[PDB]
Each structure stands twice: as C-alpha cells, then as structure tokens.
C-alpha cells in the first residue's frame with residue numbers, strides 16, 4: 001500500500017519501483033504540468049485521480065498447483081512480482 | 095514425530111519462509127523451514143510456504159522436501175513483471191495514427207511531437 005518511484009517513464013519501470021506501485025493506462029491521464037510518472041502510484045491514489053479499476057495495471061504474485069505419498073501437491077508454479085510473496089500450502093501425511 | 099520441511103540452496107534473489115500449522119493447534123510463523131512435532135497416523139499437517147523475489151528473476155526451479163523422506167514438491171518460479179496494457183490494434187486514430195500506444199503513452203513517429211502526436 002506504499003509506492004516510492006522517481007521519474008518512472010513506463011509501466012515496467014513503475015512495477016519495478018515496488019510491490020505497492022500500480023500504473024494507470026488511461027489516455028490523457030497526464031496534465032500539462034505533470035510528468036508521465038504521475039501514472040505510477042498506489043491503487044488508492046490512482047482511483048482518487050479518476051483512473052478506472054480496469055485501467056490500473058497491477059501484476060500480482062500468484063501460485064498455481066497441480067495434483068500423493070507423503071507430500072502434496074507434487075507441482076507448483078509461482079509467478080513472482082518483486083517484493084510480493086506468493087503463498088501455497090504443502091500437506092504432509094504418512 | 096519430528097517433521098522438517100526445507101528446500102535446496104537458492105540464489106540471493108529468492109526468500110522463502112514457512113508457517114507450520116502443527117497438531118494441537120500449535121502454529122509457527124515465518125520460519126527458515128517447516129517444523130512440527132507429533133503427527134498422528136493419517137493425521138495431515140500443513141505448512142504454508144511463502145516465496146518472495148527481490149527483483150524480476152530469470153525462471154528457475156527448486157524443490158521442497160521433508161527431511162528423511164523421498165517425496166519432492168517441484169517448484170517452478172517465473173517473474174511477474176510485465177504489464178498487459180491495451181494496444182492500438184482496433185483504432186488507427188489513437189495517437190493520431192502517428193505513434194505507438196504503450197500503456198497509455200504515445201511514442202510518436204519521427205517528425206511528430208505532442209502527447210498525442212498531433213503537432214509539427
């Protein structure tokens with residue numbers, strides 16, 4: 001819920017600025033006296049400025065599992081956004 | 095009765111902690127590895143694994159195992175650093191049709207300037 005960026009010029013640079021940073025892709029979002037970096041901020045901050053929920057880019061960490069003996073599942077795929085933990089449970093039974 | 099969950103050596107870019115929800119409602123949070131005592135027959139125990147990357151990493155895999163057992167949980171890690179923004183494929187008017195629309199910003203073609211590539 002915090003975002004500290006500096007003169008970010010793209011969505012990629014924004015996302016790399018921190019786990020709480022999000023990017024507004026709304027056309028003309030930038031005013032005359034503002035840098036493109038204004039598009040980069042926390043979700044609540046962008047909503048305040050009128051960016052619609054579906055125009056806020058916010059890649060998020062995800063865990064997908066698949067399917068034994070002692071441990072399950074057997075396979076797990078994690079998509080990791082820097083600074084944002086991906087969580088999944090492993091079950092042990094004998 | 096003593097069950098430890100651990101993983102093979104990882105690069106400095108990956109951090110992993112374990113939450114151990116043992117029997118008798120005994121729970122350990124954010125430890126270097128899973129650790130529970132007891133474990134009655136057919137009684138399952140759960141460990142919550144949390145993986146955090148410090149940067150956009152290169153894809154790789156690693157394994158999680160319970161010490162003393164041959165079972166393996168294969169973990170594949172991939173970066174989540176790309177934005178899936180809207181492009182201009184369905185509107186030649188975007189950026190006045192003289193620049194590329196990239197996540198809300200127009201990257202004007204040479205000779206064109208302006209936030210919407212309208213000037214010059």
Ligand SMILES: CC(=O)N[C@@H]1[C@@H](O)[C@H](O)[C@@H](CO)O[C@@H]1O
Pocket residue numbers: 027028210
């Ligand atoms: C999408 C948007 O709000 N941008 C408008 C565009 O629609 C309009 O055609 C142009 C000229 O009037 O000015 C801005 O570029």
Ligand SMILES: CC(=O)N[C@@H]1[C@@H](O)[C@H](O)[C@@H](CO)O[C@@H]1O
Pocket residue numbers: 087088089113115140141142
């Ligand atoms: C997100 C997830 O799958 N983790 C679960 C957690 O939600 C749950 O409260 C706990 C107790 O059963 O087990 C795991 O830690």
